[PDB]
Write an enzyme that holds these catalytic residues in place. Sequence first.
Site, PDB file in Angstrom:
ATOM      1  N   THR A   1       6.196  -4.941  20.428  1.00  0.00           N
ATOM      2  CA  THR A   1       7.455  -4.482  19.857  1.00  0.00           C
ATOM      3  C   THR A   1       8.359  -5.665  19.544  1.00  0.00           C
ATOM      4  O   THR A   1       7.887  -6.793  19.420  1.00  0.00           O
ATOM      5  CB  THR A   1       8.186  -3.522  20.806  1.00  0.00           C
ATOM      6  OG1 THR A   1       8.495  -4.201  22.028  1.00  0.00           O
ATOM      7  CG2 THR A   1       7.316  -2.321  21.115  1.00  0.00           C
ATOM      8  N   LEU A   2       9.659  -5.399  19.413  1.00  0.00           N
ATOM      9  CA  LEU A   2      10.623  -6.457  19.119  1.00  0.00           C
ATOM     10  C   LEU A   2      11.995  -6.001  19.594  1.00  0.00           C
ATOM     11  O   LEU A   2      12.609  -5.136  18.964  1.00  0.00           O
ATOM     12  CB  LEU A   2      10.638  -6.783  17.629  1.00  0.00           C
ATOM     13  CG  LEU A   2      11.532  -7.939  17.173  1.00  0.00           C
ATOM     14  CD1 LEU A   2      11.396  -9.150  18.092  1.00  0.00           C
ATOM     15  CD2 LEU A   2      11.218  -8.319  15.733  1.00  0.00           C
TER      16      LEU A   2
ATOM     17  N   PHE B   1       7.425  -6.229  26.324  1.00  0.00           N
ATOM     18  CA  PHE B   1       8.438  -6.464  27.353  1.00  0.00           C
ATOM     19  C   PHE B   1       8.411  -5.445  28.482  1.00  0.00           C
ATOM     20  O   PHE B   1       8.766  -4.281  28.287  1.00  0.00           O
ATOM     21  CB  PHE B   1       9.836  -6.452  26.727  1.00  0.00           C
ATOM     22  CG  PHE B   1       9.973  -7.315  25.509  1.00  0.00           C
ATOM     23  CD1 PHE B   1      10.280  -8.657  25.632  1.00  0.00           C
ATOM     24  CD2 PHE B   1       9.824  -6.781  24.240  1.00  0.00           C
ATOM     25  CE1 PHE B   1      10.417  -9.454  24.515  1.00  0.00           C
ATOM     26  CE2 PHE B   1       9.955  -7.575  23.121  1.00  0.00           C
ATOM     27  CZ  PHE B   1      10.255  -8.912  23.259  1.00  0.00           C
TER      28      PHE B   1
ATOM     29  N   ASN C   1      11.711   3.268  18.955  1.00  0.00           N
ATOM     30  CA  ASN C   1      10.661   2.379  19.416  1.00  0.00           C
ATOM     31  C   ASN C   1       9.399   3.088  19.872  1.00  0.00           C
ATOM     32  O   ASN C   1       8.330   2.480  19.841  1.00  0.00           O
ATOM     33  CB  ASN C   1      11.178   1.494  20.552  1.00  0.00           C
ATOM     34  CG  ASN C   1      10.638   0.094  20.474  1.00  0.00           C
ATOM     35  OD1 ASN C   1       9.859  -0.227  19.581  1.00  0.00           O
ATOM     36  ND2 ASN C   1      11.036  -0.750  21.415  1.00  0.00           N
TER      37      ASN C   1
END
Lengths: 205, 224, 195, 195, 213, 196, 196, 204, 222
Positions: B1-2, B109, G114
């Site tokens: 992800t980011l 993360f 997300n």
Amino acid sequence: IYNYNGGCVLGMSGSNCVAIACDLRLGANTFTTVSTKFSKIFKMNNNVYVGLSGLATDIQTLYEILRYRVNLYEVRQDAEMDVECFANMLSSILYSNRFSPYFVNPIVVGFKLKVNYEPYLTAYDLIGAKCETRDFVVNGVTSEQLFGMCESLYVKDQDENGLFETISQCLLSALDRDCISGWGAEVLVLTPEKIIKKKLKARMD
Amino acid sequence: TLGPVVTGTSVIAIKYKHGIMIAADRKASYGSYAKFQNVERIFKINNKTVMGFSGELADAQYLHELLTRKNINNLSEKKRKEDMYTPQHYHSYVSRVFYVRKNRIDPLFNNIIIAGINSQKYDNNDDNVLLEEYKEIHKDDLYIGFVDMHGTNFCDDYITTGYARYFALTLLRDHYKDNMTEEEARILINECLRILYFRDATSSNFIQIVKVTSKGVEYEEPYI
Amino acid sequence: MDTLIGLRGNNFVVLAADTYSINSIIKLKNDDNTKFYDIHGNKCLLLGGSIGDRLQFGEFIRKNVHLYQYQNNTDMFVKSFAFFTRKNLAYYLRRNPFEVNCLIAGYDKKDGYQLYWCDYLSNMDSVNKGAHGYGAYLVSAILDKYYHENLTVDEALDIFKLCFEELKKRFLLTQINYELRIMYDNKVETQYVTV
Amino acid sequence: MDTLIGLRGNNFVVLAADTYSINSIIKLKNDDNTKFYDIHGNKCLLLGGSIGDRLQFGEFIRKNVHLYQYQNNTDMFVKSFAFFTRKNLAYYLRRNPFEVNCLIAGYDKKDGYQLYWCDYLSNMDSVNKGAHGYGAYLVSAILDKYYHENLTVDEALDIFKLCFEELKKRFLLTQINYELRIMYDNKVETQYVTV
Amino acid sequence: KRWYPYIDNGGTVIGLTGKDYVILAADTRLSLSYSIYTRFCPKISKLTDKCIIGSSGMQSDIKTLHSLLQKKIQLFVLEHSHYPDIHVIARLLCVILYSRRFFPYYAFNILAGVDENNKGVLYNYDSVGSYCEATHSCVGSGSQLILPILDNRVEQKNQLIKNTNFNLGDDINFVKDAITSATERDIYTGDKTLIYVIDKMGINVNTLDLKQD
Amino acid sequence: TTIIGIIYDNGVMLACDSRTSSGTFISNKCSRKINRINENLYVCRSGASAHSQKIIEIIKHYCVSMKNENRKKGRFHEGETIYDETTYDFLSCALIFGGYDKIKKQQLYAVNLNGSIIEKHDFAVSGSGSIYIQSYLQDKYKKFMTKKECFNLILNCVKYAMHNDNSSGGLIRIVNITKSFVEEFTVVNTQMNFQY
Amino acid sequence: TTIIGIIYDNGVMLACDSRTSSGTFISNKCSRKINRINENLYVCRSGASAHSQKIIEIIKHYCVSMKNENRKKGRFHEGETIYDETTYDFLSCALIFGGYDKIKKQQLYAVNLNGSIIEKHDFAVSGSGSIYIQSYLQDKYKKFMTKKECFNLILNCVKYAMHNDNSSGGLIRIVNITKSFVEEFTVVNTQMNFQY
Amino acid sequence: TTTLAFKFKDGIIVAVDSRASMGSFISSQNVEKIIEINKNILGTMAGGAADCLYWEKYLGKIIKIYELRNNEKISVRAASTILSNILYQYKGYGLCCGIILSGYDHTGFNMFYVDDSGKKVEGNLFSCGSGSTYAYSILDSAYDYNLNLDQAVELARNAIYHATFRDGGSGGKVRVFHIHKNGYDKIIEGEDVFDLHYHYTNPE
Amino acid sequence: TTICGLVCQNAVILGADTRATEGPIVADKNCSKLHYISKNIWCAGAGVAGDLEHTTLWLQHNVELHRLNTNTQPRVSMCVSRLTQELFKYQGYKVCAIVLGGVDVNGPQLYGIHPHGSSCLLPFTALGSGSLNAMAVLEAKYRDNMTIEEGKNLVCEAICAGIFNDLGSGGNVDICVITKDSYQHIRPYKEPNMRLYHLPHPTIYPKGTTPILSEKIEYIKK
């Protein structure tokens, strides 16, 4: 502090005598050497020696400022300046130029003169952080190769002849480990009755 | 992800004579406000090992689905009770998937903590995926691992992650004893979580105390 | 750039420089330029760097010294002159850049023939030999191999002929013309040589 | 940089270049370098630019042409050879940079002595005179003043002697040595001159 | 946010040699940029009966690099029926780091051990693979504070070159004093130390606890 | 932080939480986000406490110089609030004024981070957690309330703005303002407990 | 835009505004921010309509391939929602699912930008104007409501989230879901009019 | 990092130093800057530490393969072109190298210099490294091509000493090799040269 | 740089760690982080030592000048006001989180000033890089109206928990009671090193090289 005009100073404190050593490299660029007679220690008083370390444009400038202020204070008092008043003076001169700092990492080696005599060794930083140290003190580019180096070769109280050998081996073993400094060594060990300007045949590499 | 958009809180995993004790709050902050306040973070991946999340929560389900399939795959060849995947094997797997992602740009993360019983000297050769007294473990069969987002892996007696690594861990490194009783364990975690409720912004109540005893995996919901 | 070779003997000081003016970097505007700023009190200063900053500083440091040599009937000492121009570079460093490199050289009746060395910043230090510019990496080594103690003028010029021919062979911008400033026995003469 | 002068007459083609190798820009590594990539079919190619890219391209364009001159018993035409190397620069522009400048020059039995000109990119164009490098701003004007029609070899070399002495006088890095490639009457000779 | 994947977990490895023995000492503190994760993470992992390896970069590139080297060393012992020497392990480890030259293994490692009857050898290199046979080396956060200390006992700068004898009884006490100086001055240097002595009959796992500052 | 200013039928109430975190860390727990200027007006600050604590030190300097300017019991509120705009001519901090006066009965003003002094005769809300309770206020705000009706509204507004926000304070400081200058700091310590 | 999903005692309701502006300009006035996937579940999308309209075209492709996979009347909702997470392995768009099932009575899920698929057995709210009505929901949400009780709540929630937000829609599209698959699009056109 | 090359009337004399620093700290003083390839061809690593040491050993793999397949001694020109071609593929990847290949082939005493981007230049007085320019200038006053081996190895020590004195990047032990017509001799370390002293004071 | 302080029934007890580091290497194992403002108030700060040492000297004398002007003891509410008006003028340079407190005409206060200019009264606080470790154990055993002895070991445990659980915080711990009569300046919990002691080796007398020695005997001024 910069790699430009590398060099370092160190001060050791024996029983009743103190010693201050430094290299003699006027590095033109980072990896260049154009002079081997650049003494980074100055005789600020009869018993208060200072050792500047960092960029050469601020070493010569801060020495001329300190000499202008010490001479203006010695003749105004008609007595030599001690170390405690001189040490706090450097903490204010360096802080007075906090926006445009003087890239120097000084050191102050000198007898406190309480007839009596005390070591009184201290160093500073780029902004003027006072650091009183009753034992050895070091500041410069080789600060990382000298804190741990002197931690293993330091006794509590040494005589005059023993302090010079303890400080010469402390500097020669760290100046050969650094690349941008160490083209000579000039240790200035001083006792309350005499001073000794002993040079060292360091590794010219 | 980011970017850790859905940030979670931290867990506290300690061990004692009757088993592991992992506890955490059910609050997952979204940016600067508690969007979800009823989301669990202590996921069970085996009948003897559990794992906890931290940091990003959306990325955490990806690692949970990767580990729950390995449990069913390991259960497919359970021709003996000693063939079960020990928590040390699960810890080395998560530490390996974190290092592979570390070589790339996407790091996923998280601050995964794997804890469980690293032994098979207790009768559990009948596993039920969907649905008396305790025992005493030698302190060497209670594995509690930690995995950082950079791939740092190790194991101790007590493992504290996230923001509680600066608050609960300092209170835990001097008060933790060896082979504590069951009541002394939750009286220490509830006391260390109380400090986290007063000195942390992305933390709250709704503790989810999960204990991994020698008879299974339980669940509770206190309120301090 | 511009090579600024400076060699100090025991009773003389010889300064060498480049006579090429590089304005509009592709071409050479004028040959036989003026880099030396001769001071009336036997102190031949030699600057180097951009032509715009060497002229605004060589003139300012010359009139400021000529004023001191006229306000008093005496002449300026080379030690005092070397540290005076060092102070002006450090003073004119915070306001203006002044990308200049100077080679202070002169003579005093109490300290013999001296020679100093500076940098972009103020890095004054008395030396027996020195160099500046990009050509310093090819001439600072020759001076060390040929610095026999108690030198003489006729042997020091032989070193420069063994030095100028090196810049003509293995340097980027091959310099051919040079300008020397021999200062032997209170007689500053300009012996500019080529090749 | 490196000057690449190229002059094409009515029955000859003379190429001029620099014999200075500049690796580690402060100094000159070796004198009397090899810039010309002589092709077997009377097509003296002349490259210029970085030494790393002129060697990886001059060799590749020579073996690729020598292969065509051996796969067939004929020889490559200078018009076909000039556009073949132009295609390789445009092909090797999207993947590799190839900061090179070439001066294609040769001879054909159907079009006379030709001479082309390229750039960093693929800018092929047949010309009677041309130049490259940073020294092109000082030699492209001399060729225009002395390009009398129906020239001869003995007068074209006089132009270069009137051109090489100009680079030695008003150019940044004064070049002294040069290498000529006279191609008069099917006899490619290397007359390297100095000063 | 760009995710810099390189972090220095601290720790130091000290290395000494002699005639028939090598000493590899290392602290056991695995720490973050400023906090301390744990007080026990052995940075020294044995490979054979006469060769070990220590490292001090990130803990990610240490457990991987030691297991990757142990995997190749366990393949060579069965494909050739003979244990590898240190002279051949250093070559194998020099090409492992270059295989990941663009994404380097952020872990400076030290190779210690003995191959012949005596022949005390040591190997130290950078984070990419320039192995060089040295006689004393220090690597880690305290690489600049311990290296000048070890340069006074092995190499010399004194006038009289004393200390002609360097026995194992005194050389162990010097590394115990050198690693104590790293804890008192460097921050990342830990408390528990694992002194590894490789003599002609195996290895030793002597311990020592330093200041828990 | 959150700040809520509701107007009574006779006076005005002000309340705020006490969290004021600094980079996901509670460094100034149980502080005083509200401030006292005179016997009749209070100022509750929000935003960054660095550039905002200097404004309260300036306002207190001008208000004591303005109250001594007129006479002994000569005070003013609207005139003092527009002076805060002049101190925004860079720093960024939103403020909420409010107090009692003699020219009119009560008054309340809202100063944004740029300098707008748009007053609000009904009510006002500002801060970080203000966004989560903007619609809850407009739905429960009547025309004229009582001392106990409005107190039960701000007790729920600060509690609702804290339960769903990371800048949740601990004890809240509710400050009343009336004609007789009651100005009692009704400070409570009630936490939020949902039912479903 | 705003999106509100409340759960009944038997079914589930979904409603959203129709504004979807693009850089302070109304370019897609009176659009369909909600979408239909099957007879039992609906998906209301938010965020950027560029990367979100492709997800609905993908979900409709997988759901028709999944409903034909089992049998004729074999449909599923939870299984279809977790597949949306796999399509988030870059695009950013928050979605709110919800429908009726046979394994349980009703269901509702919330997919963030997300990949989190945290379900909500009580209610859910998302979008741009969601921030202004988060506390108003938790204060008025009971345990079990009726068809008319919950309808009066979402009619005020979307109207409150539009009155104090620049992404205020015009007509809102409230969609019901029950056991008998009522699925009537109760679309209204009521504007907001405050009293005080 | 100061390297040398001579190509005298006898074989090529290669001389280097032994310093390897990382910014403002010396890693080690016992690095081997001379990496041999065959019985006659011996390279000279410079610049990067392992960015070129790998290819110097990688060249040994390619040469030894060709040394057996054709059962003939490879030339220095072929050993240079091979190393220059394999280095050009890693031009814009982040390498940093300088390599001086030298040996004795079938045609005289060849000598080449390979850079990072394959700038293969042939010459007779090469040098590379940080303190290259200092040692490059000492040879211009004494390289005469007709000097015997006795006064030849002294020039290699005199040139490196003046290069390790002005530069800070180089230094340490001085190595000087001499390529013979059928191999190469050696000289190991000086570490302290006093060519201009009487132990009085410090020079300038 | 773990610096914490708390209030008691009649005094304010502070505490700090004697360790100043350059970031990767310590500078000295004994650095007095506690400063003397006046007889009734003391200060201690974190961050850069240069912008803190002068700020104390600027405050130690400005308070003394104001103390000599009047005839009363200086209040703690005055030095915080002078620091607020001085730190805002150098908000981007003078970065120093200072905590100070002591007795005055009112109860024993303890003000915590942040480097950006903000300040707020606190019953107990911690500061520095090891503040989280100190404030953790401080919030656990913080009673009310504790005695000086009951506050002595708490501030000692607050620093000790900030020494072991932190990297840039070590050395000895020193406290300072700021009661109404006078102050205190003790250095408890020296933490002796019972490990392998350092064995310094004094080098032999003939060593070094010494090319020239400029021996000078100068005894002019005693």
